[PDB]
Amino acid sequence: GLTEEQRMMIRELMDAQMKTFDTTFSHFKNFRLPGVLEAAKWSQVRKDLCSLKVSLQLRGEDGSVWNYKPPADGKEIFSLLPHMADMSTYMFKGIISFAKVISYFRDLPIEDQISLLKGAAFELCQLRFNTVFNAETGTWECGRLSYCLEDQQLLLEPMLKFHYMLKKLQLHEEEYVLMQAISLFSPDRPGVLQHRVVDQLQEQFAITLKSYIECNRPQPAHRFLFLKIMAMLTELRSINAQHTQRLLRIQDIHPFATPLMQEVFGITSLTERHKILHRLLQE
């Protein structure tokens, strides 16, 4: 099997996930919704928003259903940004709480904790979003909220191909939370000082995930599952880089980022430029 230290490592990550992942989105409230009613910069922004166009569905407690179809391309392209801003911030807060519960993360310097959270916030959210993704319907089922993709041409978008590829691997709850740990403890994040320590921590999470697949799955059929998982994490880091650059382009012509997102994406001393992230980590 696995070393008891490896079994305890999974225990802490799973415990962190249970305490910090609102799988039913029950506590996601008070979010903004779309209301009822330089050229090269905008030209790039329109292509950034057209790729991920979704319809919104709100199921009520009484049984009624509200549905929102997105408009066609104008400034209407930023109709869902405040809602997505609230959803990202809500998810980022749960990721921050996830890292705080992990003991290996708490023992790191505060400047390294901010650097790791800044580089892995988007990735750990996509990893959590994949657990509520329905590939048959192309819908992220977030409790009462649902995000369905409007439209082969989808698989061209890397973030859509990522969710379909990751969902097809059919990972366990432990394998997902190990991907989060591996992604969180990335030593090559910008601003990280303790490179050697974070690299050794990442290797331990990777070894445990590699050992978990060997011990808990049929040996010949899942012979390369661990390597497929690492390839998805590499692709997710490429998508994280591309998403950050899109967001900074959208933010440039049309500010929409919340104060917490501004700290994560570098929008205007790590501790003095990331005071919200610093305060959330000190609580």
Residue pair 141/104 in contact (Cβ under 8 Å)? The answer is no
**Cα 193 to Cα 187: distance, rounded to the nearest angstrom:** 9
Q: Which is nearer to a second copy, 42 or 68 (CB)?
A: 68
Residue with tokens 């509520």: 132
Report the first-to-last Cα separation within the chain, whole angstroms.
Answer: 37
Answer yes or no whether residue 42 interacts with a second copy by CB under 8 A.
no
Q: Map the footprint of a second copy across residues 52-71, applying CB under 8 A.
A: 58, 60-71
**Among residues 14, 33, 110, 197, the one that binds a second copy under rule CB under 8 A:** 33
Binding mask 130-169 for a second copy (x = CB under 8 A): ----------------------------------------
CA distances from 175 to 88, 109, 132, 143, 226 (A): 23, 27, 15, 22, 10
Does the annotation place 127 within a ligand binding site? Answer: yes
- In this structure, what token pair is assigned to residue 243? 């998403």
Instruction: CB nearer to a second copy: give 27 or 75.
Output: 75
Least Cβ distance, residue 59 to a second copy (angstroms): 10
What does each C-alpha distance from 279 to 240, 275, 283 come to in angstroms? 25, 6, 6
Provide, rounded to whole angstroms, the least separation between the CB of residue 150 and a second copy: 11
Kindly list the residues in this chain that would bind a second copy in the complex (CB under 8 A). 33-37, 58, 60-72, 74-76, 79
List residues forming the annotated binding site for hyperforin.
88, 126-129, 243
